[PDB]
Design an enzyme around this catalytic site. Structure first.
Site: not given
Length: 291
Positions: A181, A215, A218, A221-222, A262
């Site tokens: 998480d 995700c 977006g 993780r995308s 990110q």
């Protein structure tokens, strides 16, 4: 690999946060005027994550064509992805409209519906075979056909019917359920096995529309998903696999969507996934499934 020994040079030098922010300063900037129209404010999950006008997916509804989604067109790799935010309670019909109009065969979902105690994403697909979903605004029907729940991911077959025309397509839904998480996974092994199940499914084939990846925003993780897939592709076709500069690939993807990857930790993890993934696509996957 020059990727691998630059990786170590960054690890020994502790300069991931610096490498990352250079990427942020060099990243393209393009206008997002449509995303920013007042009529579209409630169609965006985050006010600071918007699709560029030039690469945004347009809905073919006559009223409002807007959806927070971006076509990432990787010319040399010959692969396209649609990166989009996790659907909002009010944009779930928009989402399946896009899937229908772009002729996508796969949806890749990289987050859990609930994470860190908040809803990252609306429950946009049906959870029981016998309780299908009908999206009245876009005239679509979504039926869960089967589930295959595994340790770190779940694959779903879904039937999407255009209630107007009554054609139906099978959509494959690939749900990575194991991303921690508040950090990138410890090992890329689980993640690489997931990518390759998506690959084996055929949802990435050029005969289909672009895979839809999301995700929560977006971009994170995308971004990791598409960045590692594209580097592995370029490694596969380039004659000089040593020559794949993952940072130059990221900056090319950031021409199409802002903010991909990110955190500096995600950047580090993408290196690992590509490095580890190169070992299969150059001679030697059975040991990723083990762990």
């Amino acid at each position: 690999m020059e990727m691998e020994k630059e990786f170590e040079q960054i690890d020994k030098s502790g300069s991931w946060a610096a490498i990352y922010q250079d990427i942020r300063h060099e990243a393209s900037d393009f206008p997002c005027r449509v995303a920013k129209l007042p009529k579209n404010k409630n169609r965006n999950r985050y006010r600071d994550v918007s699709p560029f006008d030039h690469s945004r997916i347009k809905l073919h509804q006559e009223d409002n064509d807007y959806i927070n989604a971006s076509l990432i067109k990787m010319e040399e790799a010959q692969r396209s992805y649609i990166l989009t935010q996790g659907p909002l309670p009010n944009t779930c019909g928009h989402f399946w409209e896009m899937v229908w109009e772009q002729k996508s065969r796969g949806v890749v979902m990289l987050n859990r519906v609930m994470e860190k105690g908040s809803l990252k994403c609306a429950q946009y697909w049906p959870q029981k075979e016998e309780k299908e979903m009908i999206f009245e605004d876009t005239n679509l029907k979504l039926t869960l056909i089967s589930e295959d729940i595994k340790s770190y991911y779940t694959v779903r077959q879904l039937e999407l019917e255009n209630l107007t025309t009554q054609e139906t397509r099978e959509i494959l839904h690939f749900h990575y359920t194991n991303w921690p998480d508040q950090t990138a996974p410890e090992s890329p092994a689980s993640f690489l096995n997931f990518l390759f199940k998506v690959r084996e499914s055929g949802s990435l084939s050029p005969e289909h529309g672009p895979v839809v990846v999301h995700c929560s925003a977006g971009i994170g993780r995308s971004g990791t998903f598409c960045l590692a897939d594209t580097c592995l592709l370029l490694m596969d076709k380039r004659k000089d696999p040593s020559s794949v500069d993952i940072k130059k690939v990221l900056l090319e993807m950031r021409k199409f969507r802002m903010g991909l990857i990110q955190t500096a930790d995600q950047l580090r993890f993408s290196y690992l996934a590509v490095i580890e993934g190169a070992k299969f696509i150059m001679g030697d996957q059975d040991q990723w499934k083990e762990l």
